Structure formats: structure tokens, C-alpha cells
Amino acid sequence: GVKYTTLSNGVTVATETNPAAKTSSVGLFFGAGSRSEHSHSNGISALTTNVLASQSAKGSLLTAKNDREFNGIIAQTTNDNITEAGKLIASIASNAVDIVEKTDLTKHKQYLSAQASAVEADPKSKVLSHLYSSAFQGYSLALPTLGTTESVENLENQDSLRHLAKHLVNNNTVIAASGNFDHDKLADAIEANLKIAEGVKPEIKPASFLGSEVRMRDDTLPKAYISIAVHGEGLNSPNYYLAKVAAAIYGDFYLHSTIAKFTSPKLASIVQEYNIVESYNHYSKSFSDTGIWGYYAEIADKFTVDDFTHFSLKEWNRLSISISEAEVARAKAQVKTALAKELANSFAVTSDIAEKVLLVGHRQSLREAFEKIDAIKVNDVKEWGKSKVWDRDIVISGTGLIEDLLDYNRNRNEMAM
Amino acid sequence: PHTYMGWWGSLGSPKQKYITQYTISPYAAKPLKGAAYNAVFNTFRRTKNQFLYVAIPFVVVWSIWTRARDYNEYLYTKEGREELERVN
């Protein structure tokens, strides 16, 4: 029941209503993440959402969804209480400016700054967060999704109120839902309670990929954390699933897992000849129009970072040459399962349906995605590999024990032979 | 092997956690950004800074050499013949 409803105003209510859903959630999203911020006001999108999500809930679970592109509040409740959750967020949104005007941001700013620092403490999130920025340095997409401590500390109610009035508008806002409930009852409940100001959809600020390396050599950490990625296909790109399939070819790995010695990806067998890497993760992060395709890796040995990058990048070369049908068949199946896994929780699908409805304007159910992935031949992957991987610029990030990570030229040269 | 230089994993450098490095893929950068300005302004700056240390010793040595060469030439010309006999 993916059906959509457009209110008297231009707000679209998209609901993935489905029986046998364990719990139901509703969330109002407006397409203004760190993408639509600038360094002086960075993190305002997260701060304003946290304030709204901090409002008292009538037994519902208000949580804030913060992302590079989109941002909104999500309420999760039992299927019988969904209508109350819907009326709740409309009350939160209609009173958004009034709530923010009187709200004291000091406590929320501490929470947001604490979040951002905690992101920096975790090496993976730091590496990924730096990676995304280094690729898009100079554009708004480089801004951290939750902002930075110094940027947040300068935020004031005026900054957010300007932000909400710019972005929290009918054309730039969507309502998402999922669970076992009647779509019409939710839509009627929202219409009778949601009152928001009209406005034009803010133009999405452009961003362009720039191959670069950002090194945060941190010799006190026990392991070396690195990520290397290229300009992968983003949303609304015909290769969006193809990029995911390519990533699943190399898949994941964790040296201390029972599956390590028996996992399919070629790179997994290669790295164990010397226990080169403890864990690595191939991913295809996709934004509204830009995506980053690559891997994240944690190396627990100072002397094997260069060995890993050499072998991992050498394996990337096989995308354009000698890629096996078995791998593509494996990657197609693995992505399909991973795609379906993401959409299990009603909360997860509510976030997903909001993302697509905002950033691409239409959504594909698992039926369509499976029909697309199933049609991916080996050749299509190889053409994609040559287009997006072979001799294409890489962006490199790394924080711990980076001393062995050879400089950019060495790694980049491995991308072609 | 307490070599004061090790391999890449441990080059013997001390802990340097709080420093960050930044570079752009050469596939994205200019090769000749500073070539024109550098070859003139920067080269002249280096030459001017290092000049005195080359000039002063060179002036001293070349002055001594010129004095010696001129004296020898005078000796081997006719007007110096007698002194060539006197010195030898």
C-alpha cells in the first residue's frame, strides 16, 4: 500500500502501510540537511530538529532524523496509536516556530555538541565524515551532518527560525508513515491538524567530487582506520543499484568472525595470507545527486596499511576485467537481501520513503528493485567499473596509525594498470 | 638495529596525533600554478638571500688570484725581468 496522498496544500503523505508490521511510525521530513547549511550556521538543521523532537510526546517515541540532505522528526507508536502520533507531529510542526522562539537552546546545543564530539571520538564515523567532506571540499555537502562544536556554539534561535521559515514549507516537506493502519484515517488526521506556511522548494545546493586525501595521523590509537572511495552513483541515477551491486562484490570482512576463513569475496582470502586487515566494509553512499563508492577499513597492524590498500585497490581493477559471473550472481543476491533487510523495521522504511520522496520524487518498492538488480549482467558491471572506478580519482581518509598509509599518488596509481 | 630511521610502519618519528594533512589528487590540480611567478620572483628571492655568502668569499679569492696572476704577468714581461732575477 505505497499509495500517496496530497493534502489541500502541496504536502504529500506517502505511507508504506503493510499488514504484519510489528510497529508503526510516522514522521514529517523537510529536505534541509547539512547540504542546505553554511559554515556559520552549520548544524542548525540538526539543532532545530532536536528541539522539535525534544517536545513532550503523548506516549509516542519522537526521534530526530538528521542527514546530509533531508531532516525531520519521526514518531513511533503501536499500530493502534498511529493516528495520535500523526496528530502529534502536525502539532509539533504547526507550532515549530512558536516552540523554537521560547525554547532555550543551551541544553540542546550541549546535546548536539556532545553528539558531534562523540562522532569525532568514534574512528569510523570520523573517517567516513572526513571522507565525505574531503570529496566535496568547498561545497555545502562537505559540512558535517550534526555540525561541529565551534559552529554549534554560535547558533541562536534566530538562526534556526530563519532556517525553518526557509525550509519548513509545504513544497519542501513530506510526511512518511509505515505500519498496519488505514492510510485514509492518517491522511485525514494530518490534514485537520497540520498548518504550515507556503514556500518554494529551496534549490538544492550543488556539490562536485574532488579527489583528495585527508590524513589525521593519530599514533595513540590501537588500529589504523582508513576509507578510500570514488565518485559513486547517487540517487536518481540508473546505476544506483549497479553501484550497490559492485560494492557487494567485495562485501564485508571481519578477521575475528567465524565466517572470515569461509567468506566468498576474493579480497577476504587475500588479506588472510598475512592477517593484513581486521575489518573492512565496502559501501555505496548515495546522496540526492552525488554518491561515494568505496570501502572503510580498520587495520590493527602498523606495517600492513600499504599492503591492504595495494590489494584492495588491485581488487577494484577486477571490476573492469576478469570479473566472474559467480561474483555478480553473489553480489546481486547479497544486495537484494541487504536492500530488504534495511526496510524491515517500520522506522527504517519511514526514513527511506521520506528520503526518496524528497530527493527523487518517486520510490521503487522491493518488487521493482529486484526486477532491476536481477537484470544486471556481468557486462553492465564491467562497463560501470570502467566508468566509475578504472583510473578514476579516489578520495582517501585516515585517522589512526596512518604512518604506513602511502601517500595519494601511490594509492591512486593502483587504480589502473 | 637501533637505526634512527625505521620502515614505514615505524620510521622512528615521535607521536604526532594532533596534525592533519591535506592534498588534492594531481588528477584535479594545476601543474603550473606557481611556475611563472616562482621562476622569477622565488628564484630571485633565493638568489638574493644566498648571494652574500657566495660573493664575499668569491670576491676575496678572485681578488687574490687576480693579484697573483697580474704579478706573474708583470714578472714575465720585459720590465719585470730584473725583479724576476731578484726574487729568484
XYZ file of C-alpha atoms in Angstrom:
505
model
C 0.000 0.000 0.000
C 2.572 2.559 -1.121
C -0.207 4.915 -2.267
C 0.359 8.671 -1.929
C -1.946 11.455 -0.758
C -1.628 15.175 -1.486
C -3.355 17.422 1.037
C -5.244 20.596 0.185
C -1.761 22.103 0.374
C 1.142 20.632 -1.543
C 2.317 18.331 1.253
C 2.494 14.715 0.089
C 1.676 11.934 2.554
C 3.483 8.761 1.494
C 2.658 5.691 3.577
C 4.113 2.193 3.253
C 1.132 0.668 5.023
C 1.625 -3.078 5.342
C -0.082 -5.738 7.486
C 2.089 -7.817 9.811
C 4.265 -4.813 10.665
C 5.425 -5.143 14.258
C 5.095 -1.417 14.994
C 4.098 1.716 13.104
C 5.825 5.078 12.795
C 5.012 8.466 11.278
C 7.473 11.235 10.520
C 7.453 14.696 8.955
C 10.539 15.468 6.881
C 11.798 18.643 5.242
C 14.642 18.449 2.760
C 17.212 20.572 4.608
C 20.271 18.771 5.945
C 23.842 19.945 6.221
C 23.621 20.282 2.435
C 21.403 23.343 2.903
C 23.596 24.952 5.583
C 26.773 27.015 5.516
C 29.749 27.111 7.831
C 28.438 29.944 10.013
C 25.097 28.172 10.550
C 26.337 24.584 10.248
C 24.406 22.166 12.437
C 21.319 24.380 12.666
C 19.283 21.753 10.816
C 20.195 19.166 13.447
C 19.678 21.583 16.339
C 16.248 22.715 15.164
C 15.158 19.111 14.602
C 16.417 18.048 18.031
C 14.421 20.858 19.647
C 11.261 19.767 17.840
C 11.950 16.102 18.599
C 12.542 17.041 22.253
C 8.897 18.073 22.666
C 6.675 16.101 25.011
C 5.025 13.122 23.322
C 1.705 11.534 24.289
C 3.309 8.149 24.820
C 4.967 8.241 21.394
C 8.691 7.999 20.671
C 9.846 11.202 18.994
C 13.290 10.831 17.453
C 15.195 13.178 15.163
C 16.466 12.000 11.778
C 19.493 14.028 10.672
C 21.223 13.529 7.332
C 23.291 15.367 4.744
C 20.252 16.080 2.566
C 16.990 15.595 4.488
C 15.975 16.142 8.096
C 12.805 15.526 10.074
C 11.124 14.192 13.198
C 9.833 10.617 13.433
C 7.248 9.270 15.882
C 6.992 5.526 16.532
C 3.927 4.014 18.193
C 1.838 0.875 18.292
C -0.357 0.374 15.247
C -3.495 1.384 17.157
C -1.912 4.677 18.290
C -0.686 5.849 14.881
C -3.377 8.499 14.416
C -2.384 10.146 17.701
C 1.234 10.150 16.530
C 0.174 11.763 13.263
C -1.783 14.487 15.032
C 1.168 14.950 17.385
C 3.755 15.830 14.743
C 1.326 18.161 12.976
C 1.006 19.916 16.329
C 4.802 19.920 16.642
C 5.258 21.275 13.123
C 2.467 23.865 13.147
C 3.885 25.170 16.438
C 7.502 24.778 15.295
C 8.318 28.493 15.229
C 6.475 29.141 18.494
C 8.324 26.276 20.191
C 11.709 27.441 18.923
C 11.096 31.089 19.826
C 10.704 30.364 23.543
C 12.978 27.307 23.570
C 16.282 27.648 25.421
C 18.881 26.143 23.093
C 21.680 25.947 25.681
C 20.820 22.422 26.815
C 20.073 21.279 23.260
C 23.306 22.822 21.988
C 25.214 20.879 24.640
C 23.484 17.698 23.485
C 24.248 18.456 19.839
C 27.864 19.383 20.567
C 28.175 16.224 22.659
C 26.868 14.240 19.692
C 29.334 15.849 17.291
C 32.277 15.229 19.617
C 31.132 11.631 20.101
C 31.115 11.295 16.311
C 34.716 12.508 16.285
C 35.666 10.070 19.050
C 34.408 7.063 17.093
C 37.112 6.421 14.459
C 34.768 5.028 11.799
C 32.373 7.969 11.903
C 35.312 10.384 11.884
C 36.899 8.688 8.870
C 33.628 8.490 6.948
C 32.634 12.013 7.967
C 36.026 13.344 6.895
C 35.863 11.225 3.739
C 32.559 12.737 2.635
C 33.906 16.234 3.239
C 37.255 15.733 1.509
C 35.484 14.557 -1.639
C 33.238 17.643 -1.609
C 35.571 20.267 -0.150
C 34.422 23.796 -0.926
C 30.713 22.944 -1.177
C 27.986 22.740 1.441
C 27.862 18.944 1.135
C 31.224 18.891 2.920
C 29.598 20.105 6.136
C 29.124 17.537 8.932
C 25.542 16.372 9.281
C 25.448 17.118 13.028
C 27.751 20.126 12.781
C 30.860 20.925 14.786
C 31.442 22.121 18.331
C 32.621 25.622 17.425
C 29.935 26.037 14.759
C 27.151 24.877 17.084
C 28.195 27.146 19.951
C 27.384 30.208 17.818
C 23.850 29.043 16.989
C 20.942 31.169 18.179
C 17.164 30.955 17.944
C 17.253 33.469 15.091
C 19.468 31.143 13.050
C 17.024 28.244 13.351
C 13.906 30.379 12.887
C 15.425 31.666 9.655
C 16.215 28.050 8.788
C 12.718 26.707 9.464
C 10.962 29.512 7.592
C 13.244 28.878 4.614
C 12.883 25.086 4.581
C 9.839 24.021 6.633
C 7.449 24.801 3.783
C 4.728 22.807 2.070
C 6.672 22.179 -1.138
C 9.875 21.213 0.722
C 8.210 18.938 3.296
C 6.921 15.368 3.108
C 5.092 13.110 5.555
C 6.122 9.461 5.808
C 4.436 6.548 7.547
C 4.561 2.773 7.799
C 2.762 0.011 9.659
C -0.630 -1.679 9.995
C -3.042 1.238 9.732
C -5.575 2.738 7.356
C -3.963 5.292 5.056
C -7.067 7.465 4.748
C -7.537 7.851 8.504
C -3.947 9.038 8.908
C -4.244 11.471 5.998
C -7.489 12.927 7.343
C -5.951 13.263 10.805
C -2.942 15.134 9.406
C -4.990 17.498 7.244
C -7.104 18.593 10.214
C -4.015 19.398 12.319
C -1.098 20.395 10.045
C -0.840 24.132 9.320
C 2.415 25.267 7.691
C 3.443 28.294 5.665
C 3.754 28.077 1.901
C 7.098 28.474 0.193
C 9.143 27.475 -2.810
C 11.318 24.382 -2.631
C 14.839 25.667 -1.866
C 17.168 24.862 -4.738
C 19.485 22.032 -3.737
C 22.958 23.493 -3.329
C 25.344 21.941 -5.881
C 28.335 19.804 -4.971
C 31.135 18.293 -7.048
C 33.564 15.482 -6.287
C 37.237 16.400 -5.827
C 39.735 13.593 -5.360
C 41.801 14.366 -2.274
C 43.453 12.803 0.760
C 42.849 13.891 4.356
C 45.195 12.315 6.909
C 44.657 12.644 10.670
C 47.629 10.532 11.706
C 46.844 9.526 15.284
C 49.623 7.371 16.704
C 47.960 6.816 20.092
C 45.136 4.740 18.606
C 45.480 0.935 18.568
C 44.437 0.482 14.927
C 44.656 2.289 11.608
C 41.271 3.333 10.218
C 41.104 4.248 6.530
C 38.475 4.698 3.845
C 39.004 5.004 0.091
C 36.197 5.779 -2.324
C 35.397 7.257 -5.722
C 32.561 9.327 -7.169
C 29.882 6.658 -6.943
C 26.451 6.892 -8.485
C 23.967 8.681 -6.247
C 20.196 8.534 -6.068
C 18.093 9.166 -9.217
C 20.952 7.561 -11.156
C 20.252 4.486 -13.334
C 23.359 2.842 -11.844
C 22.276 3.389 -8.225
C 21.627 -0.320 -7.728
C 24.553 -1.166 -10.002
C 26.854 0.744 -7.655
C 25.464 -1.227 -4.714
C 25.981 -4.485 -6.620
C 29.597 -3.553 -7.310
C 30.181 -2.861 -3.617
C 28.664 -6.192 -2.580
C 31.132 -7.969 -4.873
C 33.829 -7.108 -2.334
C 31.353 -7.100 0.540
C 32.386 -7.061 4.182
C 35.043 -8.772 6.269
C 35.938 -9.144 9.936
C 39.048 -11.129 10.804
C 37.729 -12.362 14.171
C 34.453 -13.674 12.726
C 33.719 -17.362 12.244
C 32.853 -16.610 8.599
C 36.192 -14.953 7.798
C 38.029 -18.043 6.561
C 34.995 -19.155 4.517
C 33.652 -15.928 3.001
C 33.347 -15.589 -0.768
C 34.949 -12.237 -1.684
C 38.393 -12.656 -3.208
C 39.867 -9.833 -1.133
C 38.889 -11.688 2.041
C 41.024 -14.696 1.117
C 43.910 -12.471 0.011
C 44.185 -10.453 3.221
C 44.355 -13.561 5.423
C 47.682 -14.716 3.972
C 49.204 -12.159 6.359
C 46.240 -11.027 8.500
C 46.554 -7.699 6.720
C 43.275 -6.186 7.951
C 41.000 -6.772 10.921
C 37.834 -5.411 9.302
C 36.776 -3.682 6.108
C 33.421 -2.600 4.717
C 32.507 -1.797 1.122
C 29.600 0.612 0.743
C 27.826 2.809 -1.804
C 26.749 6.006 -0.058
C 24.294 7.896 -2.263
C 23.085 11.478 -1.884
C 20.422 13.343 -3.859
C 22.608 13.643 -6.969
C 26.079 12.517 -5.840
C 27.342 9.266 -4.383
C 30.546 7.884 -2.924
C 31.563 4.292 -3.666
C 34.408 2.714 -1.744
C 35.328 0.880 1.424
C 36.048 1.526 5.076
C 38.834 -0.465 6.696
C 40.363 -0.859 10.153
C 43.913 -2.226 10.254
C 45.252 -3.468 13.591
C 48.875 -3.632 12.385
C 51.065 -0.603 11.733
C 53.050 -2.341 8.993
C 50.232 -3.605 6.746
C 48.274 -0.479 5.778
C 50.092 -0.115 2.457
C 49.674 -3.836 1.797
C 45.910 -3.587 2.283
C 45.448 -0.521 0.092
C 47.510 -2.166 -2.641
C 45.486 -5.381 -2.580
C 42.080 -3.770 -2.079
C 42.676 -1.344 -4.942
C 44.147 -4.134 -7.064
C 40.871 -5.968 -6.481
C 38.923 -2.929 -7.677
C 40.719 -3.276 -11.010
C 38.970 -6.613 -11.499
C 35.645 -4.783 -11.847
C 36.592 -3.832 -15.406
C 38.439 -7.089 -16.188
C 38.095 -10.758 -15.242
C 35.028 -10.199 -13.054
C 33.363 -13.580 -12.603
C 29.701 -14.376 -13.163
C 29.578 -16.107 -9.779
C 30.617 -12.861 -8.090
C 27.918 -10.837 -9.846
C 25.348 -13.504 -9.003
C 26.557 -13.372 -5.400
C 26.578 -9.573 -5.296
C 23.114 -9.361 -6.846
C 21.731 -11.751 -4.235
C 23.596 -10.109 -1.355
C 22.389 -6.625 -2.298
C 18.800 -7.819 -2.674
C 18.901 -9.314 0.817
C 20.639 -6.231 2.218
C 18.108 -3.983 0.486
C 15.225 -5.931 2.022
C 16.903 -6.002 5.437
C 17.056 -2.203 5.584
C 13.282 -1.992 5.080
C 12.257 -4.475 7.788
C 11.762 -2.030 10.656
C 8.846 0.352 10.215
C 11.128 3.155 11.406
C 13.697 2.348 8.723
C 11.176 2.319 5.877
C 9.627 5.567 7.129
C 13.043 7.200 6.869
C 13.620 5.599 3.467
C 10.260 6.590 1.988
C 10.799 10.160 3.169
C 14.270 10.216 1.610
C 13.166 9.078 -1.847
C 10.008 11.197 -1.917
C 12.147 14.272 -1.209
C 15.365 13.636 -3.104
C 13.983 11.878 -6.199
C 10.205 12.430 -6.107
C 9.352 8.751 -6.620
C 10.057 5.464 -4.874
C 10.584 1.889 -6.034
C 9.280 -0.984 -3.948
C 11.368 -4.109 -3.465
C 9.495 -5.653 -6.397
C 10.897 -3.059 -8.798
C 14.375 -3.073 -7.250
C 14.587 -6.858 -7.550
C 13.479 -6.645 -11.183
C 16.269 -4.130 -11.810
C 19.053 -5.947 -9.964
C 18.088 -9.304 -11.471
C 18.678 -7.779 -14.921
C 22.259 -6.711 -14.111
C 24.573 -8.796 -16.293
C 28.330 -9.126 -15.906
C 28.888 -6.715 -18.789
C 26.838 -3.957 -17.158
C 29.020 -4.196 -14.052
C 32.182 -4.100 -16.163
C 31.019 -1.012 -18.058
C 30.203 0.632 -14.732
C 33.605 -0.347 -13.368
C 35.398 1.292 -16.280
C 33.170 4.360 -15.993
C 33.340 4.939 -12.234
C 36.390 3.002 -10.980
C 39.021 2.349 -13.639
C 41.596 5.139 -13.410
C 39.071 7.403 -11.667
C 40.051 9.771 -8.884
C 39.902 8.415 -5.350
C 39.298 10.268 -2.095
C 41.256 8.973 0.895
C 40.658 9.442 4.612
C 42.508 8.009 7.581
C 42.974 8.733 11.285
C 44.922 6.121 13.268
C 48.471 4.825 12.859
C 48.374 6.242 9.334
C 52.163 6.440 9.053
C 52.301 3.373 6.804
C 49.484 4.605 4.535
C 51.441 5.576 1.444
C 50.642 8.981 0.009
C 47.948 9.710 -2.547
C 49.960 9.112 -5.722
C 50.790 5.535 -4.751
C 47.206 4.574 -3.931
C 45.747 6.423 -6.912
C 48.180 4.754 -9.314
C 46.895 1.346 -8.205
C 43.527 2.286 -9.714
C 44.910 1.497 -13.181
C 47.465 -0.901 -14.630
C 69.306 -2.290 14.965
C 68.572 0.973 16.764
C 68.654 2.644 13.370
C 67.477 6.231 13.677
C 65.261 5.531 10.660
C 62.898 2.579 10.537
C 60.494 1.386 7.866
C 57.108 2.871 7.026
C 55.217 1.337 9.936
C 57.674 2.866 12.431
C 60.042 5.445 10.949
C 61.243 6.388 14.436
C 59.196 9.583 14.464
C 57.544 10.603 17.749
C 53.815 10.640 18.345
C 52.148 13.315 16.197
C 48.433 12.791 16.740
C 47.110 16.363 16.516
C 48.367 17.146 12.962
C 46.246 16.798 9.824
C 47.432 16.657 6.206
C 45.588 17.752 3.066
C 46.274 17.199 -0.615
C 44.331 17.179 -3.871
C 44.562 14.384 -6.381
C 47.025 15.585 -9.031
C 44.314 14.439 -11.445
C 42.499 17.576 -10.248
C 45.247 20.164 -9.717
C 47.333 22.569 -11.806
C 50.945 21.558 -12.538
C 51.944 25.142 -13.429
C 50.128 27.151 -10.753
C 53.292 28.834 -9.465
C 55.765 28.132 -12.272
C 55.591 31.573 -13.888
C 55.649 33.554 -10.640
C 58.079 31.145 -8.980
C 60.774 31.012 -11.657
C 61.243 34.783 -11.438
C 60.210 36.041 -8.009
C 61.055 32.997 -5.890
C 64.311 32.283 -7.717
C 65.389 35.904 -7.310
C 64.490 35.736 -3.613
C 66.614 32.621 -3.072
C 69.499 34.101 -5.052
C 69.370 37.398 -3.159
C 69.286 35.678 0.230
C 72.176 33.349 -0.608
C 74.226 35.887 -2.584
C 76.447 37.449 0.076
C 77.787 34.103 1.297
C 78.925 33.276 -2.248
C 80.031 36.770 -3.227
C 82.253 37.710 -0.282
C 84.389 34.527 -0.399
C 84.406 34.697 -4.193
C 85.461 38.347 -4.150
C 88.276 37.570 -1.711
C 89.581 34.525 -3.579
C 89.279 36.102 -7.022
C 90.991 39.290 -5.848
C 93.908 37.235 -4.535
C 94.014 35.262 -7.788
C 93.954 38.430 -9.894
C 96.777 39.930 -7.845
C 98.872 36.780 -8.249
C 98.196 36.491 -11.984
C 98.942 40.163 -12.635
C 102.174 39.908 -10.657
C 103.264 36.828 -12.611
C 102.436 38.512 -15.917
C 104.481 41.535 -14.866
C 107.374 39.246 -13.935
C 107.443 37.536 -17.321
C 107.241 40.803 -19.267
C 110.446 42.680 -20.036
C 110.005 45.469 -17.483
C 109.810 42.857 -14.716
C 112.780 40.774 -15.870
C 115.207 42.257 -13.352
C 112.802 41.646 -10.477
C 112.268 38.094 -11.707
C 116.024 37.748 -11.275
C 115.877 39.442 -7.868
C 113.051 37.293 -6.497
C 114.572 34.039 -7.792
